[PDB]
Each structure stands twice: as structure tokens, then as C-alpha cells.
Amino acid sequence: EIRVTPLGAGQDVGRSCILVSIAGKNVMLDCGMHMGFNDDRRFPDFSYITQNGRLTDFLDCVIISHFHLDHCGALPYFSEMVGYDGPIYMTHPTQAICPILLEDYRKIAVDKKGEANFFTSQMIKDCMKKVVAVHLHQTVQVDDELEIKAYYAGHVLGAAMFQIKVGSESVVYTGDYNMTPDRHLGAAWIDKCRPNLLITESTYATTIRDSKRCRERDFLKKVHETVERGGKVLIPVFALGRAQELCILLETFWERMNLKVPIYFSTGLTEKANHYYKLFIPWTNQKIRKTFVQRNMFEFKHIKAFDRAFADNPGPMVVFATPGMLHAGQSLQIFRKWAGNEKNMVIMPGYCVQGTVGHKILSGQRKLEVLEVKMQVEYMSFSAHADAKGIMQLVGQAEPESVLLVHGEAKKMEFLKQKIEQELRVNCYMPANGETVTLPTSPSIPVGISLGLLKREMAQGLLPEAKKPRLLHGTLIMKDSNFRLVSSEQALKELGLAEHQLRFTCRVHLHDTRKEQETALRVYSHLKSVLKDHCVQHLPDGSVTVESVLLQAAAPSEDPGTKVLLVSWTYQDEELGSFLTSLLKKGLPQ
């Protein structure tokens, strides 16, 4: 059976981790932290999975989805001071990019919180030495019976859906994903594999996001308005994903509109991010991988590095800066520099965490903590998550047997549960964190078959005698290693048992005045006339044959009014023999 225990993201967001038991094997899908709890509760609870035992002994394999912090932030914590040496599977791009993000989070955690029992850089290097990398669609056997497979996702670069299949059992974990083809990230594509379970997120399940293309049309027309008014444009984005998406979008638009105004990009992570985006071309869909023949799209002709004196250099300006939530805010520094002007513009393309300075800016008051804002704001939605119709399309393509919702908010999750149960009549599950849910399976046990027996039975099925029970017969030889199905004759010659023959001879007593030779002739003619489409032949020694049933007029008995007919048959045609004896008990025509 299927056991699913989410340690995190149970009716919640962040610190996602799911423990899946399939046929007694332990697959741990994803392990990250989450902001908001400065306590150890941001890390996933380990007192259930192994209590205080051995993680490598109890758990069997680790799967990592993508390089977002709430998904790959907890690997050195899970594997280094808690202790784990088992297999960790994650893609080559995500493997290349997670340690840099981990190092940045480590430095930021030192500079903000300074937790004493915190993972160190050297054992971060040790963990990324311990991890194992997997290509797309590569069926990787963790051991003999357990294998994993990757599917392209589109949440970010390197993101991967994962299908975990043991025997015929199959659980597909989407992780985070998208259906909308990004300007540099392709849509998620899956085989119609019919999984037994579908673990999925639904971050945006109550919002039907509209036309993406018209959304960047709105963004481009307003940024064109601002640069034609000569103002300053500041875009607070986090430096991974959407940053390079907007970079490609503005590179295309600026080249086509043939403009000359300088633009700048936030430093720090730009060199590493752009290096990885250059060196991981075969993940960024067929547009960029086709354009790679002439040029390289990630090599930017108009985008340079930002300079703090270029900040107060005058003229029209467009700058991408960090971060998206403005907690530290060199972007907030330039915001405070440019807040006096009414000409300048900002676009906030992501959902801000409420109760923070980003929430103060998102709300409409002038005074934010206190400084008064004057330059114009916009709140756009360039999020790369999945929507309601996209989720319905994914489940309709995948056709799973049951689904399980994580990574979102509870009322939204319930709305999707109601809608999917009304739509596809497929069972849904809503685990809380720390809750184990159990689902029954259909473990069909394999068996062999003789090819000749298969060929003749398939020929009989192809013959136009269908819809009648043809009664597939044979026997199952069991060795506890190779269960096989064989024919009866094949089993006999294999096992050496004698082909036993059973014979019945009934003495039909016929009471009539006809002669015995004429009685046998009457038997032959009567059986030929009654049994239509039956092999009724007259053997020249005076006998009758009906298929494999032999009728012989026996020696004259002591009763002149009684004639003995020996009807002889085997067990295989003994229904026909019983019918023949019933007809002869009814008697010959006279």
C-alpha cells in the first residue's frame, strides 16, 4: 500500500517534505526550509521518520525537485549533522546551482540570525559531493526493484517532475511546475503513464490567470511610456528565474524597438546565474536551443552591470535590482534615492509577504517605514506557477487514480478538491503536516505463458466465435521464482506424470424387433440425422463414430427383446457421451 506523510507544506506553504512508503521502501521527496519561523520548526521534523535512529538505515532514497530555497535549503541540515549517506537524486542544473544559493543563504543567515547549530560551507561541499545527478527521462534504478524517472517541469530552470515506480506501482510528484510556456522555459510534458498517485501543488488554484502574452504587452507598453517620459524604472526581483526571464524579454523588445537607452542589472549573483543559464542551454525550450545556431540569447548585447554612480547619473533609466521582497534592499536604497521624483516608475511582479515593507509599498499609503513615496507603482503578476485550468489539464493528461494536494492555502485546496471531484470523479486527499495517509493498491503478480498455447488461443479468439466463453485452461507451475502458465500436455511432459485415460462404456438396451446389424445401421443414421455438424462416420466393421465416441452393437444377449449397444467414450467428450446415451435411452426410430 501507499503511505504518504508530509512533514511540511501541510495546509501551508514552505519547508516542503513528503515521505512516501511504497512496498516497504522509503522515498523522501524534497527537503527545504521556510521563512517566517526563526525557530528550528522551519526545518522539517525528523522525530517521526527515524525518531533518533539511523537515517541511511531507515530511509532509502532522496529526490530533489528544483533549486528554490524552500525545496533545496535543507539538504546539508538533513544529511550532515543529523547524518545521512544514502542516495540523493537531483538534476545536473539543480545540482550545479543549489550550492551557490545555499552559500548565500548561509552567509545571510549569519548576517541576520546567526544560528549557532547551522550548516557550514565545507560540509555543504561534502553534501554536494554526496549527491547524484540524473539526465531527463533517464530510468535510474536506486536498487533492483525501485526506479525513478524525470519529467520537464518549467517552474524554473532544471525543475523536474518525478515519477516513482516499483513494479506496477506509480506515484508522480509534480513538485512546483507550470503549463504556460515561458519566454525562456518550456511547458511541462508528461507521458500518459496512468500513475496510481499524483502528488501536486496548487499555489494559484483560485485564480484563472489570463493571457500571458497580453500581460507582457501591458508591461512593455507601460515601460515604454516611462522611458519615453525619460523617467527611472526600478524592478525589484529576486536574482533567480524571473530575473533572466525579464532579461530575455527586454533584450528582445529593446533590440526590436532599436532603442539606445542604457539598462542595468543587479550585481552579485548576475555572473553565476548568467553563466549557468549559458551553460545549460538544453533546458530552455526549442526557441532558444534553435536560436543557439546563430547567436546565444543569454549573451546580452544591451545589459551591463549596475553601478551606484550610474544610479544618480541622470537620464532615462531601467534597472533590475534585488530583492523581490525588499527586506534588505539595495533596490530599496535606490527607491529611497528616487522616491522624491514623480516621474519614475516601479513594477512589482511578484506576491509580497504581508506585514513587511513590501506590504507597505503594495498598500496605497504614502508613508512607509518613515518616508513618503511619490513615484508611481504597479502590481503585476509574472509568477511562473500553475493555474486552475492548467492543473485540470495536467490531471486530465496524466489520468491518475488519486491525487494529493500540498504547497498552498487550505480554502483554495478545498475548492480545487471540490472542483476535481465534481469534474473527473477522481479521489483526492488533503493531508495535514505530520499526518500519514494510507491508500490501497492492486499488486498484480506477473506470470509466464507458453508462446504456442498463446498463439493457438489467440487464433481461436480471432476466429469469429467471440463473446462465448472459450475457457482459457492450463495450469500454473510455481517455483516461487518464475511463476508460469503452461498447457496441460506441456505440464504433463514437464513433470513426468502419466497421461491418465478415463473410459466409460454404457450398455444401451434397445427394445425393438429390428435386426442387430440393421440396429447398428439405425444407430449410425439416427446419430447422423440428429447431431448436426458432428463427425458421424460408419466404421466398416459395423461400428459408429461420433467424434471420439465409439458405438458398437455387442454380442446378442440372453434376452431376445433386448439388444446391447456399447457406447464408449473418454472424459473429454463425456458430455457428448452423456447426450448420446440420453438420446439412445429415448430410443431409435422404429
Place this chain on the structure above:
Amino acid sequence: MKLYCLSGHPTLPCNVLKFKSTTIMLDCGLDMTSTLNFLPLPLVQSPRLSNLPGWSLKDGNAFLDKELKECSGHVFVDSVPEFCLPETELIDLSTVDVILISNYHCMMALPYITEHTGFTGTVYATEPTVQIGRLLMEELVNFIERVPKAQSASLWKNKDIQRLLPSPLKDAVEVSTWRRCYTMQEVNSALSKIQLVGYSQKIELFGAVQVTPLSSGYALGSSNWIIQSHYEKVSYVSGSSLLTTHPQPMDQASLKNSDVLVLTGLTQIPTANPDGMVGEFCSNLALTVRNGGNVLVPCYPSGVIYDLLECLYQYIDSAGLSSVPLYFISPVANSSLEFSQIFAEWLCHNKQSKVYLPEPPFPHAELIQTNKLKHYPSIHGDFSNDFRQPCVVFTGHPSLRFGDVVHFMELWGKSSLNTVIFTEPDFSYLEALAPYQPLAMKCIYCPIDTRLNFIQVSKLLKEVQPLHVVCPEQYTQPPPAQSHRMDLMIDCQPPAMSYRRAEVLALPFKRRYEKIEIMPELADSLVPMEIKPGISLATVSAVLHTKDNKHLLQPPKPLLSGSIPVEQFVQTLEKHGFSDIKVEDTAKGHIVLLQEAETLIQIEEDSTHIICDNDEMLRVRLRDLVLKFLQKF
């Protein structure tokens, strides 16, 4: 299973394998042996090749004076170069269903099969294979083009004249099916018919078969294939390199435990020590540079070029020759470098870690940054502005019969100080260099090979132990170069059957079992029973449901086996209610009489017989009794 081999070439195969209900063909050879025979194509018409004298028929009937030309006592044919095809008429390639590719050299011949013949199924190859293949077919079509020489001769292609001609024109094989080169619309048609695959990807075909590619390691993305059904395994290995090379290392774990192993793509020069000849290359290159001339190296834009540039990077750092520049000249040079740059996950662990520590896996990007090596698409233009002497040139085509290679050595043939270095083993350099003879150029033949030698073949076969082995006749037979040597032939137990060009083999196997599934409710219903220790069996009664060649059983005539004992028979008749039953014995059987219905039963060894009157309910009672006193099969 049946195998049709359509290529007598050991390295460039086409193998049509017939297994179960599907047809899977492997690889695509485009033998440039006829290209070697044809005359070279100058980019600009050289006076000496313009006025090469015409060899004449001794009878004088045919117009071979203008159909053929002679040079240095040796004869060549004057036309556009041709290409030898695999014999396509042995099996209808339309009925051939699914095509697999090992590597780009084995996909060179794809538009021929995929456009003209009428094949309409699917084709599989890995991403680096298909991309480097597209680059190679682009270069090839460009060089057969870029100067159209539309002349074509056919009276030499007449068989009698071919017999009358001397060797190697006497030695030409299958001249009739040689064809002219293909074009961009054909290239794009095949390259849109392609589909993709990564390593260890399980591709199911109709439920009938499943195919997986494994890293052979010879080239970037070069892949051996594994075709399996649930009891049958065919390992097709073509061109692996188990030495430490730039691609992913060879993976024999899934290769082992195979029913039929087909082995092709072995070495051409078994006696070649690769790294030693690479060092000799570097020494000769340094000698030529110190002498102050120009060196030519003809090479394909994959593999050997990358290895050569790495070693030359180390050696130029060793010898301090940063003054002399390197020019890589081919119309596919820029895209070749970029594709080799971004193809990272297909490499080995050293280069993957180099990626993981933000630097490019190959050092020639750093070489470009240091401007020692410059790439150029064609010799006309800015390359003519930036040319230097002394110099190094790696040129586009290694078969030497067309391209910037032939133009450059027409330029440099008079001088002796310059040097040509052959680096690819796919042709005989004697027949390659025959047309330019006499030649003042220093020629040094140091071929570079990574295909596994026969020692490693023996080691690999002893490691994997397959049931059947299939290898070419040229690998069974001793080579003509060293027939005395014994290690040059493949040895296997059992000895492998060979094959010749356009040959048919029936592999030693009989199909016995296949994969069927039971359904859990029916498995619950079925109850096994035991007659022998360790043997428990159960009769079955089900309904087969077969969609897409996969088979399953669901609930909607067995016979008897086993002798019945007379003593237990009469004992259970007495304990069931039958009485007054008398038994007499015979030589081998027992006659038992039941007085009710006057039933006489004789029991013998594998013989039982019941005779009674016209009775029904007693008869069916005895029916169920005698059938329940045995085991059902």
C-alpha cells in the same frame, strides 16, 4: 530472430533485425571508399589537375580518354564524387519499421533511406548525435556543392570496362548503386523526422519491445543499443571506447546477461598506441614549426579534434610556440565549438565538475580568449586577410577528396618544408595521397583511434558472456597486413558466425515464453495445490484481454491425470454408503463389481474402464467420484 546485414563495411553498418512482430534497423553507413576513388574537387581549378592526361582504353572503343584521367602511372575517374550505399533492395525499408542510430558517422547516410525509399516510421538518436550529424551533413553537402561539377561518366560504370580496368578500379565493389549527393530539403526532411532520447531512457514500441541507449564513449553521445523483451535481450555494441575519453564512460552493467550480442565498430589500426602517437604528433608539429613552415591536419569537427587541441594546448605551453597561430577552417566550425561547449552532461565526471566550478569543460574556449586558435568558416575573405606563415591549419574534410584541404595542399605541394599530418584512420592514406603524387610535402602518418582493440574485446566478452555473438567476416578473418599474427582475430566461445555484404542470418534462438499479467481478483480466486515437494499448481479458467500486444487475464477444458487406487476406492464407497462390493485381482489390474446398477470397473496401469446399465444419477455420482479421486490438469 533474423538479421540482415546490408553493409560489408566493418565500421559503417546497416543491420535490419527482425524480432517478434516489429522490425528494427540499426545505423546508416555512407562509405566514402568510392569517394577515395573519384578525382578531387578543386575550389579553384589548378593547372596540373586541369591538364592531367587522359588514360585510354587499350582497345580504344570506349571514350575513357575523357571519361577517365591518369596521374603518376595511376588512374582515377573524372566526375562529381559518388557515395556507396547499403543495398536497400534486400528488404523493403517501408516494411522496416523503427530506426536506431548509434552515432553521427552512423547517421551520415540518413536522407537516402528516409526520403527516396518510402520508409515512414520513427527514428531515434541522442541529442549530441543528431546535432553533430546535422553539422556534418551540412559540411558534406556544402563541399559537394560550393562548386558544381556536374560531369558524370557511366561507361566506366559498365561492368566489362570495370573488369578491364586495373586495381583499385578493378577492386571496386557495387559500382551500380553509387549515387550523387543529397540536398538541404532532404536534410531538413530527415532532421524533422528525427525524435529524441537520453541515456537509459526506456522507449516502448507497441508493447512488443523496449529499447534503451547506453554511453559507448567513442564520441560525444555515441551510444550502443539494448533491445529487450521480457525474456529476450539483444545488445548491439558499435564503436565503444573504454579508455579515459571526454564522453560518458562505457556502461557494461546493462550490457551483460544478453542473449544475442552484435559487435561492430572496432578499431581500424589495432597496433596503434593512441597517446603515444599523439605525443609523436606533437613532436613532429614542434619540429615543423621550428623549421618554419605550415602544417595541415584534416579532421572531422568532433572528437579527435577536441582531444588534439587539448594536447596541443599543453604542448604549446611546454614548447613556448605562442607566436605560431592555429586556424580551424570549416563552415561548421563556430557551431561545432558552441555545441561541444554546451554539451556538458554527456561528458565525463572531470568535465562535469569543471562545469560545476564555473568554467567551460573544454580549453579551446580559453584558447579563443587567448587568441591562439581562430576559427574561420571559409578561406575566402577575412581569413585571407589574417593568414600567417609559419602556421597550423586544421581543415574540414579528412577524406581529402574535396574541400579546403585539397585547395591548401595544391597551394603547398611544391614546397617541401611544410608538413601534412593524417589524424583519422577511416581511409588508406596511400590511396588518399595518390592524386597529388609526386609531392614535396612531408607526410607523417600517425592515425588516432579510440575504438577498442581485440584485447579489450576479449576482456569485455569474457566479462559479459553472451549466448550468441555476431561479428563481421573481416573481424573473423586475419587481416592481409599481418596474417601471421593471431591476436588480431576475435576469439569467442562459441565462435561467432560471420557475415558478408548483403547477407541473411537466422540467429540461434527459439521463442518460448512471453510476458502476461494476472488480475488480483482472479489471483485471489485461484488456489494452488501440491502434488510434488516444491511444486504447487492450479488449473486456470479465465478470459484474455490483449490491447497493444500486452496481455492480461480476467475471470469470465481441463482433463485428468493420475491413477485411482482400488483399495481406497472400495473403502470410500463403503464409508459413503455403497455396499456389497467385491474385488478380484488380475495380472496387472483389479475387477471391482458393485451389485447396484450392475457396475463392473476394471483398473489397470494407465487404464480405467467403467461399464454399467442405462443409469443416470448413479453414473453422475460415479463421475464426480472418479474425477475427485485424481488431480486436475
Place this chain on the structure above:
Amino acid sequence: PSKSAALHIDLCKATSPADALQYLLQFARKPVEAESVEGVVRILLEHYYKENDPSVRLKIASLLGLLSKTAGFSPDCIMDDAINILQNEKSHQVLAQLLDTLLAIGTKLPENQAIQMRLVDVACKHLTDTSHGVRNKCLQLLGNLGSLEKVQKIIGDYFSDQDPRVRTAAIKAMLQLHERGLKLHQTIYNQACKLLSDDYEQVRSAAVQLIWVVSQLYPESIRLVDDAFGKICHMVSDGSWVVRVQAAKLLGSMEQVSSHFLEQTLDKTAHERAKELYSGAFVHGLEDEMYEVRIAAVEALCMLAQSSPSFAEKCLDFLVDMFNDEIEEVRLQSIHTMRKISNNITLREDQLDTVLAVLEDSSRDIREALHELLCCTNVSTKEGIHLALVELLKNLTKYPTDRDSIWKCLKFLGSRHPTLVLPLVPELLSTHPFFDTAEPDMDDPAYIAVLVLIFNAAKTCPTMPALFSDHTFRHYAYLRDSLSHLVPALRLPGRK
């Protein structure tokens, strides 16, 4: 002669695979017989066929078909092939070779009745194999030898049989029967729906072509074409892009549909938000995948928009926002479809971004296509004419090479609607109400561009020669002298 010598050589050699394959390959690759000796060669081949090596037998059968491709033989070879098919039941290879020879004989020359195709069809029906042996080939045999304009039961069974390859061959036979006519029925529609639901690739791709062809055959189920169209759209949202390209081209080939169902397909928006500011089929099928399905979608949209006089606005917005599709082929096809649908069409707000489109870096094809769009379009408002003029003059002063297309599109604008420009005449050219305005430059391209629009407007409306100044009089004389095909004849007092 040569055939007899080849047969004698083959009989004399009698090597198992070697001489047989060599002789077969030589006879095939040398030449055609090009005579009546093909029958004698076929007789010798049939005599030699009674032997081993079924592979060599299949090669001989293929050679016989290649010889029959020259149309020398007919009925005697047909009878011999019938005898060989009746007596040669030896595995899949020989069965396939016999099927191919039968197809070659049937399609080679006769194309007639009276045991020229009917006997072969009956033979194929009786000799349908048990496991993939002939089934596909005999299905295409009956497809190419469709009996008459009177097989439906057996094709229905072969739709639901085992192999997807056999299913696809049956569907290809359905293509052949429809292109020969044969007037298929509505049970084919039902079984085509259950073949659309087939859980497998390319079976869907050809079966949806069948559902298209029965739907365009006749619209009578309950609504047949609307149900088929909805099935088409719910099939468009499949992941397989080859299937999607096929889907979009075939739904574009579909031409009649319920209009309200078509707006239901376009139904979900920032388009109507912008419209208020001024005052799921295609909406997934355009921005689902890349340029293949995009081009197929826009060709579908142009065909059915040319069909439907309505419906155009709800794709007008869906084109004006989907200009910048970052694939220039998609760009050009978008402009071409906007041209082809631009009839009874207003662009009361969309002029601004569709002319920010013609402001463009180099894109000479794109700018020329947009000039064609602006010359073949319609506008409603005087303000729209004014701004169209001002950014067209931006384009001319920014890229002073396509001024010829600029002048011709301004000409077509003036000819298309003259009356819109009438209030602008004092404003576009400075004609200060009492002053003597200085004479405008003669060969200034901007002034030429405005003058040609003025004259093409003044073709019909006569109420502006009095509005003209004297420089306009002599400039009309000079422009009519110079650019004969850009300005028309007029009725000015100076130039009678």
C-alpha cells in the same frame, strides 16, 4: 534470352543465399526488361520459387512486382500470383511479399472490374492473417481496390482489433476510400469517436482526420459538427505537437459551425479592460507551444474568419496583442491574416499598438507587411487618421528607403476613404488664415507623402480646390507630371 540465361545461371550455381541474392540483385539493378519477355521471366521465377530460402522467395516476388511496374503483364501474371498466394502460406515475409505483388498488380495498369480487382479483394479478405502478417497490407489492398459505389463490417472490426499499426493502416484505407468517394456513414462517426479515445499516438492523428471528414460530409446527429468541433478542440489541448498541428490545419479546413459555439471556443481579460478604459480552445491553442502550432492556428483563424462575416473583432484583439510573438514567421503570418480578414473592420483603439508595430528596427519584411496592412485596412475616426499620419511620417523620416511603399499606402488610404481627412486640410499643411505662407519644398519626401494623400482624397470630394493654395496648384501639376501612378487625374482650374 537474357532472362533465360539468368535463370540457367541461377540453376547452375544454386548457392543457398549467395548466388540467389547476387542474381536477384543483378537482375533488379541492371535494367528493366522493357519487352514482352517479362512474362517468360515471371514464369521462370515461378518455376524457381518452389524451393527453400523464403527470403530469396520474397526478393523474387519484389523483383516480379518491379517488373510488373512496367505494365507489360496483366492477367496471366495475375493468375500466377493468385496461385502462388493460394499455395504459398509460408510466414510473414512471404505473405508480405505476396501482398506487395498483389498491390503492384492491382494498381499497375488495369484498374477495372471482372476479376481484375474484385477477385484479388476476395482473396485478401479470405487470406487475412492471424498476427500482423498481412492485415495492414490487405487493408491498404482493399483501400486501393475499393469495390464500387454501392467492406464496412470488416473495416469496423479492424478498427477495434489488436494492433495500432493495423488501426492506422485501416484509417489510411479510409482516406483512400474517401478520396475515391464511397460515401461513408454515421456509424463511422461513432467508431471514430471511440478511435479518438485510443490512448496511443498517431492513431489519434489520423482518426481525427477521419472525424473531420465525416463531419464535413454531413451535419446530422442530434449537433454533429459542433460535437465534432468540440472534440477537435479538446484534442487540440493534447500534448503531442504533431497532433496539434494536424488538428489546427484540419479545424481550419472546417468552415461552417455554430457561431455561438465559435465564441464559446474563444471565451476565457485585459482586452476588455482596455476597451472599458477607452470607453478555451484558441486561447490555449495560440500560446500553448511554439511556431508550428502557432502558424497552424493563425491559418485556421484566417480561413474561418474569412468564412464568418462576424466574429472578427474577438480575433482582431487576439492578433493585435499577438504581433510580438518573437518568431518572425509568426509575425508575418499574423500581419497577413490581419490583411486577409481586414474587411468590415474597425480599429478604434488598436491603431496605436498596430503602428507601434510598424515602428521597427530593420525587419524590412515586417515593415512592408505593415504598410500593406495599413493600405488595405479601414479606420473610422479623424483622430485616428491624424495619428496614423504622424507616426507614418515618423517611419518615413526614420527609415528613408521604403518611402515608395509609404506613398503607395497613403494613396490607398486616400482612395479607400476620402471624407475623413477633410477637417485636417487646414491643419496638416500650414495655411495661416491671412498670411502669405512660404512656399513648401518640392521634393521633400514628407511633403510629397502628405500631398499624395490629399490628392487621392480629392479624387471624389470636390470641396477643397478652394481650400488649396497656389503652391498646391503647381505642385499638383508637378506631381501629376512626375509620379503618374500615385496621384490621379483631378479637375483643378489651372490644369484642365
